[PDB]
Design a protein around this ligand. Structure first.
Ligand SMILES: Nc1ncnc2c1ncn2[C@@H]1O[C@H](COP(=O)(O)OP(=O)(O)O)[C@@H](O)[C@H]1O
Length: 175
């Protein structure tokens, strides 16, 4: 019922940690909408510049924000991306940074067929905790949380914890 106020959630962390697997499952089991920012920019061609080095077009951050702004004002969206400093702070009610042990994350990305230089850049992003610090610099510390994401059983505990959070938030914000 388009009579209920619904929350917005950010899922962030290094490529490989489990963001899209977790977001699709939360969407199926809550009725909220999951948007993968990478897939959105491909579908709507939201790019400015090309990367010869990595062989890929470069994300246009301001056109991403314009494209999503009205949907975000209406509520009930889960957003997934490997960055977060350029999103409006007002968009999110809670932020989760997914974390994966370096040994486990290395094997996930190798099987996806990343080359040597791509492997190294992402493994260093995780061991230096880059996305965790970006989140704490951009949102209030009490709404930012780290989630372990190394095995099926952790995926299952994350789904259960976030589904319960969503049910309690809806009760508190529809008196
Ligand atoms: N908790 C988990 N346990 C084991 N494998 C996982 C877990 N979460 C995700 N994966 C797997 O890791 C790989 C990358 O997950 P994905 O959703 O594509 O990462 P991201 O969206 O952050 O780049 C996929 O093969 C997926 O099945």
């Amino acid at each position: 019922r388009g009579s209920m106020l619904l929350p917005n959630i950010l899922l962030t962390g290094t490529p490989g940690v489990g963001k899209t697997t977790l977001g699709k499952e939360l969407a199926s089991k809550s009725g909220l909408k999951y948007i993968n920012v990478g897939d959105l920019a491909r579908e709507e061609q939201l790019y400015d510049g090309y990367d010869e080095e990595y062989d890929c077009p470069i994300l246009d951050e301001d056109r991403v924000v314009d494209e999503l702004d009205n949907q975000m004002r209406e509520g009930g969206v889960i957003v997934g991306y490997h960055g977060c400093d350029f999103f409006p702070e007002r968009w999110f009610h809670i932020v989760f940074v997914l974390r994966t042990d370096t040994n486990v994350l290395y094997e996930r990305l190798e099987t996806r067929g990343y080359n040597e230089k791509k492997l190294t850049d992402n493994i260093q992003c995780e061991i230096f905790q880059v996305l965790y610090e970006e989140a704490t610099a951009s949102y209030k510390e009490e709404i930012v949380h780290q989630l372990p994401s190394n095995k099926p059983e952790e995926l299952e505990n994350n789904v259960d914890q976030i589904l319960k959070w969503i049910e309690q938030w809806i009760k508190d914000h529809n008196s």
